[PDB]
Amino acid sequence: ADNLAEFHVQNQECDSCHTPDGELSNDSLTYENTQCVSCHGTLAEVAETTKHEHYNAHASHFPGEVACTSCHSAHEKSMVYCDSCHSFDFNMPYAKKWLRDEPTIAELAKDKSERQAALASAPHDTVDVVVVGSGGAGFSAAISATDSGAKVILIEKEPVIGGNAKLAAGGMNAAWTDQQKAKKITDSPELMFEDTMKGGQNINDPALVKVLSSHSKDSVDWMTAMGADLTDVGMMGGASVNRAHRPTGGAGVGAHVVQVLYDNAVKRNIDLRMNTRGIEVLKDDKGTVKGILVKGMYKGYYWVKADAVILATGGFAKNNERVAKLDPSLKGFISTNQPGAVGDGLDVAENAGGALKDMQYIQAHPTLSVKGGVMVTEAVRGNGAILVNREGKRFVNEITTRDKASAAILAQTGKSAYLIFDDSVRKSLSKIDKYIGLGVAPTADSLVKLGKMEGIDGKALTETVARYNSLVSSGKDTDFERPNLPRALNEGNYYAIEVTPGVHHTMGGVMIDTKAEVMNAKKQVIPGLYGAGEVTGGVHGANRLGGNAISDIITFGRLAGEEAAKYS
Ligand SMILES: Cc1cc2nc3c(=O)[nH]c(=O)nc-3n(C[C@H](O)[C@H](O)[C@H](O)COP(=O)(O)OP(=O)(O)OC[C@H]3O[C@@H](n4cnc5c(N)ncnc54)[C@H](O)[C@@H]3O)c2cc1C
Ligand code: HEM
Ligand code: HEM
Ligand code: HEM
Ligand code: HEM
Ligand SMILES: C/C(=C\C(=O)O)C(=O)O
Ligand code: NA
């Protein structure tokens, strides 16, 4: 057979997958996927049959309930979503090579016929608030608006939930939490504010940073109340004290937070629509929001009538063409991002009259795995790892800000460096076991052996770690002035991860005020239009602190949902 449906219909009728009339149920293909599961079992049951030692197409780190049609189309060959970041050895029936080529909002102007017919029709739904994007900000907004009495529709253009938020590793910043106090950490919102402003080169809007710092504990409390574990508190670059909250043992914050938010949305019966892209904010004759035109992948164009639209669409760091026009120094770099993070939400915001700000400030994460492409968390450094160059020497304060760390690594021989750590660091941060599983953390029982394996001078490496451990014992890094020296690298085996910078986060975006209301270039509010999360500008300035994005998206998402509900 040339496709999956052709395979099946050899022994099955059309209505084995389809409704009685043949019509597709909805853009989430809810009915159709229910039929796949009726025969094959749930994703977990299918996973039992597709185990490899270190990976499984049907058992990944993605949170939520991943629809079968995310990867298996019926009447055409289809792509394995995992191939957008990894190259695992897969043999999916009817596969084709991964290629993302999504039309821009501008290109969709060519559907003039189709869009006019939709806008001339009745609204498919009439609700209070539409939230665009199923990352942390969007789920938080949908939940908070729902708890404030609003009827919400939440849309996601991708086949899977969670955006980049589901990938978050190192943690969620907050002060001064019960969780911090339980670990004998002393902090304050004021200190978080000061670190954030300094870290951003004082470009940040201080009113927005005040919301970030002052709301941070409440946001940790809100997540915890919904069932999250934010009890482990680690150090990140550019922080005065440990304030990056994450699950017990140092697991990834993102997949966890997104799973909690998903479960909470499901509990509240929030109307979540996948494969549904927000295209155009609709305004009335006085310039207030009246709804949104969307494009369903399977069902086509339609509009939703609503008082408020919350754009929670994330950043543009995957779009290297757009990135390179704003910061040419990042041209041709790899990205940490999900394949959809291309800035179409900003285009929607600008078309609706929203102004952008701080667009030129784009963060490279200093440590992507050369071997695997993926982000290696800053928490590896925060929990004690060092960086060495090919000459086997330290060359930078490993917990400085990301601008400086990225520059330092790019200045080294080969434009890459190596994270070096031991089993004490490994045992302190369970996320590290994920890199070992990915195959990007080669190991040996001596640094001479590890050095030989990886092309690092083994004698120099050995002496470097001995020297570093001596600085840890004496309490002061006189070589690079690293201010936090949590562990000696002296237990068990040693590990190396080759790392280099990659495009990660876009600090600029739509201009909002402290109530998450979108403003035009004259700083006039667009009534009914809100923005929250990485789609916004002004929170992070010229350089975002590690841990501050998850803080942002929960705080501003929740605020936007409450404000939108009140407005409606
Ligand atoms: C690998 C990785 C690890 C990270 N780790 C951390 C960490 O530990 N701590 C931290 O603070 N930050 C971290 N960050 C940064 C942080 O996770 C991102 O800033 C965060 O994902 C922003 O959340 P968001 O809700 O604004 O957007 P996202 O989570 O990106 O979600 C936006 C969603 O909207 C969608 N969307 C876009 N346009 C449309 C449209 N037109 N219609 C419908 N849907 C649309 C998407 O496809 C996406 O699903 C990390 C980022 C990455 C990539
Ligand atoms: C049986 C011969 C059969 C028919 C007939 C049929 C029709 C059909 C159409 C016309 C569409 C497109 C509808 C639209 O509004 O665009 C469509 C799409 C999907 N189908 Fe189908 N289909 C038949 C068979 C089957 C079988 C056996 C399955 C499940 C294995 C199946 C499933 C799907 C799914 C999923 C879609 C969405 C698009 C896609 O994934 O290709 N169909 N079908
Ligand atoms: C729903 C859209 C759906 C999916 C997805 C799906 C997947 C799937 C694959 C990838 C195969 C292997 C095909 C190949 O080897 O080339 C496969 C095969 C079988 N399926 Fe299936 N399937 C979906 C829908 C359904 C439904 C609704 C049924 C039952 C009515 C069904 C059953 C089967 C059977 C039987 C096979 C052959 C292998 C087996 O498990 O016996 N599928 N399907
Ligand atoms: C949803 C629950 C779902 C079903 C059903 C399904 C079916 C399915 C079958 C039957 C196979 C063949 C297994 C076999 O050889 O016996 C198969 C294989 C792969 N699939 Fe699948 N699949 C479902 C979900 C998904 C999703 C969401 C993805 C992509 C993230 C995906 C992908 C794959 C891949 C890849 C394979 C090949 C696996 C391998 O190890 O080579 N499936 N699926
Ligand atoms: C697609 C559904 C998919 C699969 C399957 C998958 C697997 C996978 C494995 C096996 C690892 C190693 C650690 C583990 O066992 O969980 C791993 C690690 C990372 N992945 Fe992944 N991954 C899938 C999809 C994607 C996509 C599309 C991206 C990029 C947007 C991505 C990213 C990452 C990152 C980052 C890691 C590092 C470890 C971590 O952060 O937990 N994955 N993945
Ligand atoms: C903490 C972060 C990423 C990571 O884990 O290194 C981030 O805030 O982007
Ligand atoms: Na931004």
Question: Which residues approach ligand 3 with their CB closer than 6 A?
Answer: 4, 7-8, 12, 16-17, 32, 35-36, 38-40, 68-69, 72, 74, 93
Kindly state whether residues 338 and 369 are assigned to the same domain.
no
Instruction: Supply the CATH number for residue 472's domain.
Output: 3.90.700.10
Task: Enumerate the known binding-site residues for fumarate.
Answer: 377-378, 402, 504, 544, 547
- Which residue, by CA, sits nearest to atom 15 of ligand 4? 50
Kindly state whether residues 164 and 262 are assigned to the same domain.
yes
Q: Looking at the CA of 75, name the nearest ligand.
A: 2
Domain range for 151 is 103-359+506-568
Kindly state whether residues 469 and 536 are assigned to the same domain.
no
Tokens of 33: 């996927």
Tokens of 312: 């929670």
Kindly state whether residues 76 and 185 are assigned to the same domain.
no
Examine the fold and report which residue of 69, 99, 129 is the final residue of a domain before the chain moves on. Answer: 99
User: Is the CB–ligand 2 distance for residue 69 below 6 Å?
Assistant: yes
Which candidate, 65, 114, 74, places its Cα nearest to that of 93?
A: 74
Instruction: Supply the CATH number for residue 54's domain.
Output: 1.10.1130.10
Could you tell me the distance, in angstroms and rounded to a whole number, from the CA of residue 445 to the centre of ligand 7? 43
Could you tell me the distance, in angstroms and rounded to a whole number, from the CA of residue 244 to the centre of ligand 6? 9
In whole angstroms, how large is the CA radius of gyration of the chain?
24
Which candidate, 93, 85, 89, 87, places its Cα nearest to that of 68?
A: 93
Which strand ranges, in their side-by-side order, compose the sheet holding 271-273? 271-273, 152-155, 129-132, 308-311, 525-531, 517-519
User: Is the CB–ligand 5 distance for residue 57 below 6 Å?
Assistant: yes
Kindly state whether residues 129 and 93 are assigned to the same domain.
no
The 3-class SS string of 393-418 reads: CCCCCCCCCHHHHHHHHHCCHHHCEE
Cβ-contact 69, 3 below 8 angstroms: no
User: Is the CB–ligand 1 distance for residue 158 below 6 Å?
Assistant: yes
- Which residue, by CA, sits nearest to atom 4 of ligand 6? 377
Cβ-contact 3, 74 below 8 angstroms: yes
Tokens of 223: 């997540």
CA-to-CA distance for 220 and 175, rounded, in angstroms?
9
CA distances from 431 to 61, 168, 246, 517, 539 (A): 12, 11, 11, 36, 28
Residue 164, Cα to own-chain centre: how many angstroms? Answer: 2
Strand runs labelled E in 428-559:
443-444, 494-506, 509-511, 517-519, 525-531, 536-537
Could you tell me the distance, in angstroms and rounded to a whole number, from the CA of residue 37 to the centre of ligand 4? 11
The 3-class SS string of 89-108 reads: CCCCCCECCCCCCCCCCCHH
Kindly state whether residues 194 and 113 are assigned to the same domain.
yes
What DSSP character marks residue 530?
A: E
Instruction: Supply the CATH number for residue 551's domain.
Output: 3.50.50.60
CA-to-CA distance for 157 and 153, rounded, in angstroms?
13
Could you tell me the distance, in angstroms and rounded to a whole number, from the CA of residue 228 to the centre of ligand 7? 25
Cβ-contact 138, 184 below 8 angstroms: no
Q: 3-state class of 501 per DSSP? A: strand
Kindly state whether residues 84 and 35 are assigned to the same domain.
yes
What DSSP character marks residue 342?
A: S
Phi, psi of 242 (to 5 degrees): -65, 125
Kindly state whether residues 463 and 326 are assigned to the same domain.
no
Question: Buried (b) or exposed (e) across 46-82, using 16+ Cβ within 10 A?
Answer: beeeeeeeebebbebebbbebbbbbbbbbeeebbbbb
Examine the fold and report which residue of 444, 470, 502 is the final residue of a domain before the chain moves on. Answer: 502
Could you tell me the distance, in angstroms and rounded to a whole number, from the CA of residue 201 to the centre of ligand 5? 33
CA distances from 227 to 163, 220, 256, 533 (A): 21, 11, 10, 22
Atom of ligand 2 nearest to the CA of 32: 35
Cβ-contact 30, 65 below 8 angstroms: no
- Which residue, by CA, sits nearest to atom 10 of ligand 4? 40
Which candidate, 505, 501, 502, 482, places its Cα nearest to that of 552?
A: 505
User: Is the CB–ligand 6 distance for residue 160 below 6 Å?
Assistant: no
Task: Say how many domains are in the chain.
Answer: 3
Kindly state whether residues 82 and 210 are assigned to the same domain.
no
Residue 7 CB contacts under 8 Å (≥ 6 apart), including other chains: 1, 93, 94
Experimental technique of record: X-ray
Cβ-contact 426, 358 below 8 angstroms: no
The best mutation among 374, 429, 435 to test binding of ligand 5, ranked by most ligand atoms within 8 Å of the C-beta, falls on 374
Kindly state whether residues 556 and 436 are assigned to the same domain.
no
Examine the fold and report which residue of 502, 523, 546 is the final residue of a domain before the chain moves on. Answer: 502
The best mutation among 365, 380, 534 to test binding of ligand 6, ranked by most ligand atoms within 8 Å of the C-beta, falls on 365
Kindly state whether residues 376 and 354 are assigned to the same domain.
no
Kindly state whether residues 349 and 494 are assigned to the same domain.
no
Cβ-contact 377, 214 below 8 angstroms: no
